[model samples]
Target chain A: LIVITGASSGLGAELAKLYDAEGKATYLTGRSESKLSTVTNCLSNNVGYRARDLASHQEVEQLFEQLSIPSTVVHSAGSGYFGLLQEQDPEQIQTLIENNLSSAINVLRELVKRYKDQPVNVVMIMSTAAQQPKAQESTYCAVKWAVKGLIESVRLELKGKPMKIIAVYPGGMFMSAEDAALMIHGALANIGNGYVSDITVNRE
Target chain B: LIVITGASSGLGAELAKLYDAEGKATYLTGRSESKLSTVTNCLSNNVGYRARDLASHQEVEQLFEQLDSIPSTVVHSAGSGYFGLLQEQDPEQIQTLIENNLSSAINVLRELVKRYKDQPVNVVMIMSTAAQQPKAQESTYCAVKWAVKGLIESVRLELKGKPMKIIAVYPGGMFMSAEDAALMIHGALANIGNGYVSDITVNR
Candidate 1:
């Protein structure tokens, strides 16, 4: 089974659709129940979903309890806010941190525990923000950079293990979501014996 | 007025002493009341302090309000560390790391930027070499440090045409004493030009 987080919309939804089209058994998750259901309904294959906020440890644990061990997990859940740091609302800043950075950490912690001895592929959908700073994207870039650092360090720790960690850093979306998903799928599919630790998708 | 976070211990306490010895009026804050009091008691000059977690926005506001005058400089040296394999870490511990390292920096930076708008202020963010490179067993620690680096860089762009100077210092492993680090920081602040120094890497 393949599990996808942030399947409510954007890249997660696209990836879910792609996997479903391939007649793959998939599990979808996101914060919005309605949106998650909408995506699952569009697929004809066997697809299950449990809507829970990955930021909460309890919720993340509950999510794993209901699922069978999967061979691959794609973490594509995150949000962004653009504005001067001082002008941003404190509450909004907190929410962003939970939704992006905390959620990623929570999911990775659980995945690592469950798949320590198993052969699993993990894809982290990071952003170009993870690679460089941007004007008016202080908090957004901060969270993205945090995720990048976490992924990089975890990659080092998991060296020589069966768990293959891949980081995808996509720049501004110049194509449709489906096209972007196809590119990601293609990149993951073409990794033969040698590993592809990092992939950068950008406009030509 | 000069402001220092994490003034209860480590580099923050050392910097607090350096400034206090020069008879500079200062305000200090940290998570421990007893430690903050100990640091304050050791100072011979005019200094004030409030014990509050910098991760809380409300507490940061309270810390700023209790200050007697607008601060001309801010030394953000507050942070914590957790080192181990990612899978070995508890989820709750990860949350603590984020709150202590990333969220605290965000809260402090947001408050300072708003308060020092259009005024000449020097903001020093004490990051680590972890911000510059990933290290094994330092996933969460590196994440938060990199987040602070991203935050500092983006805030610098946002504060363009303004008088606030955002300086980021990346100190490597424990090759130097906290007193030496504090002295280097003080020297950088004193010797730098009117413009900001974007990155300063301190190593053996």
Candidate 2:
């Protein structure tokens, strides 16, 4: 099974619809259950949804428990805001930190703990925005760059294990979510025997 | 006046003692008030302590509010663990993430926000380790790294008006909690105006 978080928006929604259309079993999570339902409807049968705000501990855990089967999870859920850090409402900053860092942790924890002995499955998290520091994009950089680091380290240090964690670091993407989905699908499809794709992108 | 975190042990403690002996007003925060007292006992009157766990939002507010008169703040409070993927325990991983990412953020926010409007001061957060790889000793590489990128970006963008933000990426020289103090203390003590130093070795 394939799991995708933040599936209600951007690349995640794209991945969910594509994977389902390709007849892959996909479980999706996001703040918008309605978007997930729509994504599922677009590619029926092989899709499921959990409308859990990943930033919430209980909601994220609930998601893992509800996740059926030993499935590969792709965490595509998170929020990014930039411009002025001071102007950023403290509440918004908190949400950004939680969404980018905390939610992913919850999902990964449930995945590893629950499926320690699962088959040769793969996990991928969308980690764009870790590119050379651009102007006016710090929060996004911190969250995604952090994801990129965590993902790369996870891939490198899995050490003779059945699980493959691939991090997709797409550089400056076009706003189209579908292309992002294709990239994610590609990342997941490439992993086997704990193999990670060696792309041109070096770790940031 | 300057405020620092993680002052009870390791780098923070060492920094506090060094600053106190130099007669620089150093404010310290950590879980152990007793340990903090011991750490500062050898120092002069230049040290202050607020026994606070950074996770508490209210306590952070209260703690930072007291720093209204401070001219600079250095957030050094952080934790690290290294559990690579597969052997990756989710709970432990999240703990590393929280410690690496949140603790420092809490400290920076508490101080910067409280005094952003008061005076023009320099703010620095210690960035240790590279995100490019995972060390077996700690799982905090990714979190620390990601925080480095995110934190710097946000500070530059957010706190641009109120203060100069400098993220000093710790590099080179076997860190001698106290011995290295001689080098770190006098070397261009203030952050380069709105400039960031990243992944570079500090030669003293």
Candidate 3:
């Protein structure tokens, strides 16, 4: 089974649709139950979902607790911030860090604990910003870059083992959420015994 | 005045000596109380210290709680890493590496963000070149250093006109001693607020 987080909208939702179309069992998590219901109801395949914020450690733990361990995990549950650092609200700053960096870390830690000895494929949604930083989007880029590092490090940790950690960096215009999800779907369709390690999807 | 973490040994202790020679009041934190004492005893300037494990959130909070509101800069120079293939590392060891290298840096920055709102405060993260490359036993080190790099890059944008400035220095390990690293840091400190510089790599 495949576990997909951020399944309410955008890339996460699109991935849910694509995976479902492939006749795969997808366990989903998003922040809103209503939106999750809307997405799951439209799927024809077996699907299980829970509405939980991945930023909350308790909620993340609760998410895994309710499901059987999945063979593949797709984590796309995060948002970015733009603007001056000090001008940004302090509370929101904390939230962005928690959601993007901390949430991803929490998920990875849980997965490692449960499936250390098993064969698993974990996909993380990074950004081109992970490779370089720009003005205004400092904090958001920082979070992604941190994700890049975390993924890189963890990939090393899992080497010679059955686990494959794939990092996806998407760029360019997707035209629509579905289009972007298609790009992600194509990238993820190839994982088997060897891991892709890193990939970047850019617009034409 | 200056705040320095990892002041018990390595570059942290060396930086402490340099700053002390400049007559700055230095507050120090390290994992070993006795070591902190030895370092402090050798300093002729105003120095106060408490030994605490920065990897613990509670201890990190406690370290700052014991301090008066800081002014000028914070130099986080302490880090620890285990060198081995990923699978060979135990769960507790991975936990220790993350807490020591990644969590400690985040906690310090959060504290700095909360406290230094009036005058501009500068934070210098001593990172490693492991951030840019990979090695057999240095995967964990690379992850944490990259995290430090990412955090520094993001936090820089958040500082609008506020006095808070962030800088990162990535120096090659083994080749550079505590003294050499301290000299490079002095240069970066002088260059703070020059622009949105992501990091400086020191090598000879």
Candidate 4:
């Protein structure tokens, strides 16, 4: 089974579409119910979707409680703010940091508990900001960097378990979400023979 | 107040001594109660210790339940792992490895977050390179170490109620000998609001 988060738009939406194209039962989630419902409405009957406010812990729990243990997960939920750190809105900072890192964690923690007895594959959609630092993007960089550390670290804990985590760090933002989703789909299909742990899709 | 894990021996023991020597109230934990008691017995007053199977969720919860709000630092230096090919490992061994290395770290952090919300605390991780590079015969080690790194980074983002400082040390797999780094962290603890010192590398 395939599950995707951040499916309201961008690569998450595209990946949800790919699963639908393959006639697979795909579960989708986004912060916006109408936006997410609009996306899944075009898919097949088995395409299930839910809306979750990723910043809230109880909401995350409720969302996970509704889903079955999925073999493949595309966690593409995140946003960022670009400005001087002192001038940024605290609420925006909270939302960005929570969505990018903690939300990924909420999903990973639930998956570890649910899939402890089975093999699982997770794709953490990050950005090249995680790889290095940039000016005016300190908080955003910090958020991605945290998620990068998380994916790398958790992959090791799951060594003996049938779990694989793939990281996709795309730069330049020029590549369409469909292209990025397809690339991940390709990686997922051929992962039986050991997969690449890190991929820099749009490297500069 | 200072909290130290894996305090039965090695760097954790040395670090515990440093805290005791400074006349600070220290809480210590280890798997062997008698061994931990032997160490704490020689310390000054205001020292509290608990022996726990750090990998067990109930034991970790119990250990943290006895501690008060920390107005200081947390040194989580507990971990061990087995080395071998992925397929050659036994299921029980895998569980043991993850409990010792990754899950134990997670349980510790969760309790710390719960206990110290709205307060300030520093967390120090004895980082291993196994998180960054994978070796042929050490898949389980690499997996758990990486997960520890991930958990620390993500928890920084999740610290909504508490002001948290996180420090990771990479000392070339030399666990018990980083006495200088411990002192540096102690100094940072003494001067709490001087901003966070991200990574400390002391090459031997």
Candidate 5:
């Protein structure tokens, strides 16, 4: 079974569509219940979904309780904010931290526990912001880098275990979500038992 | 005037002592009031401090309010972390890690930028090698450290052509004492001129 977070829109939604078309048993999750239902309703195959804020540990725990062990988990849930750090509202900064960094921490903590002894594939959808910083995107880059660090360190902990952690760093959305999803899908399908730690996708 | 965070112990405390010995007017802050007092009392020269949690934006603001004016140099050395596999860590522990290591830096930086807009100020962010690469059992620690590095780098871009100078230091562990680390940081700051050194990596 497959589990995809941020399945309401963008690359995550497109990935869900692809998996559903392939008749894969998948579960979808995002913050917006209506959007999640919209994505699920358009799909031909039946799939499970739960709308819960991944930043909340309780909600993430409930999300895991509702599903079986997943063979692959794609974490693509995050948001962006751009401005001079001093001019950005404190509340907005707090929200960004919760939405991006806190959510990843909550989701990954649960996954690491459940998949401890099982064979699992974890794919983290980071951005070019994870690789470098931008003038107006300080907070956004901070959260992305945080997730990148979390993924890297966790990879070391799960070394020699029955788990594979892949970090995908994509540049700007110069292509459609469908195309990005296809690239990710193809990469996952092609990489066998050998470790493919990092993937960078850029526009030509 | 100089301002230092995480002044209760370790490198921060040693730095405080050095500055006090030099008879420079300095302000200190950390999470523990008693510990901060201990550090201050040991100093021969008078220094100012208010123990406040840097993780709280309101408290960080109050900390600035207590200051007579914006500092010419701000040394942010606050940090904390947990060591364990991602699965073995608790949710609360992860939250604390983000608060101490990431949020505190954001809060402090925000205030400094606002108060010292277009002014000549040297901002030193003390990071770790974890910001440069991953370490086993240090997922959350590395996460916050990497986030702070991203924050500093991005803010440097925003402050381009301005007088504020941002420097990031990545230090490795175990061999260097707190006093030595403090001296290295002071030396780096002392050497700044028309050509700025944006990053310093201290290895033993």
Candidate 6:
């Protein structure tokens, strides 16, 4: 089973479509239910979704119940709002922060339940924000930074399992979501490497 | 230089003293002016502190301004309230959770500014609860666990000099508080290794 968040467009939608093409149980999630339907309808039976506002704690819980199996998950659902910190709206800041932080934490905690039991391979998306600090990128950096931290700390929690979390710090804009998705499947196709992502920052 | 928060009492205070003994310029923060004074007074020139309630947004901002310096830090001073899910006290739970989560995050962010001109080694004290599933005993787990997520995510905002966040996690337990000084340090640290209470089930 495979689940993709932010699946209505970009990398998430691409990943969902690709996974569905492979006849896998590919689940999608995002803000737009209409988008979910559109994406899934274009795909096949394997793809599904539960619309959610990651800010609300309730919706996170519901998203977990919706994904029924110990599966590969790609957290490609995120937004990049460009603006100076002082000029940016707090709600947008919180939304981006929550989208990356709250949603990841909420989903991971729920998924950890299944991973602990079944030891599924998890691929969490990372960004250049995670690789190194840059000025004017605090909000996105904060959330991505936390995601990397959570992945690292969570890796330590596993006592006896082959569970692994690869922190994919996707850099630059050269690699599209399609390339990122390709890298994920390529890594998964390999038997040994369990968790990895290709969304590394593209250094020009 | 080493900085510790919640430094007026418990493990945070002990950390301050140990850092002082090592001849590190230790900066501490806590709510009580008197208590912070008591600790600050003992170390003479080796340790420093500015008393403030870090949980408040304004106070947290003020904290960044006082005693500014680039220092390797461990956020040891934090709080947690013990209450089952059914009987969870909103104020108590929220206060403790925010202190552990938001306060520590703010302090670290503020501290990061001091370290901006130079690269610093950063070690954040994050709890294990956040890594595990939300279980029966997960009320406190939720609060503490959430902190782990919040801080690590926030800290990733400043990535430089290949900083390493040395994570430490141990089950919760009792510790003596209301003491002016480090209560034998090891047996008395708070917000870091030990849990506020014991027998925690960190499932998934």
Clashing pairs in 3: A85-B157, A85-B158, A86-B158, A138-B154, A157-B86, B120-B163, B120-B164
- Rank all candidate structures by their TM-score, best first, as comma-separated numbers: 5, 1, 2, 3, 6, 4
TM-score of each: 0.95, 0.77, 0.72, 0.55, 0.95, 0.59
Q: What DockQ results do all the predictions give, each relative to the true complex?
A: 0.87, 0.38, 0.26, 0.05, 0.89, 0.08
lDDT of 5 by residue, B168-202 (tens): 88877737888888888777665434577778888
Q: Write the per-residue lDDT of candidate 5 for residues A110-192, one digit (tens) a residue.
A: 98888767888888898999999999899999999999999998888887888778899878787778888988887775255
In order of DockQ, best first, we have: 5, 1, 2, 3, 6, 4
Off by over 4 Å in 6: A55-57, A81-93, A162-164, A192-204, B1-7, B10-55, B61-104, B107-204
Interface RMSD of 5: 0.7
Predictions ranked by lDDT, top down?
Answer: 5, 1, 3, 4, 2, 6
Worst 10 residues of 2 chain A by lDDT: A195-204
What are the per-residue Cα lDDT tens digits for candidate 6 across A52-110? 87655567667776556645777776777554333445456556656676666566666
Candidates' lDDT values, in order? 0.87, 0.60, 0.75, 0.70, 0.87, 0.57
Segments in model 1 whose C-alpha atoms lie over 4 Å from true places: B192-198
Q: Which portions of model 4 show Cα errors greater than 4 Å?
A: B1-200
TM-score: which is higher, 2 or 4? 2
Q: How close is candidate 4 to the true structure, as a TM-score?
A: 0.55
Model 2, A1-204: lDDT tens digits are 777777887878887777777778877778877877777777775556778877666776677676566456777677667654445555665677778877766666556566646653545454446644543466566666666666556555556656656566655444356765665566554433344543222222
lDDT by residue for model 4 over B66-175, one digit each (tens)?
A: 76665478888898857754445554575576567755675676666666645667778775766655555565566566555655665565553457666786545555
**Top DockQ model:** 5
Question: In terms of TM-score, which candidate is stronger, 4 or 5?
Answer: 5
DockQ, candidate 2, comes to 0.38
Least accurate 10 contiguous residues by lDDT in model 1 chain A? A189-198
Among residues 3 or more apart in sequence or in different chains, the pairs in candidate 5 whose N, CA or C atoms overlap within 3 Å are none
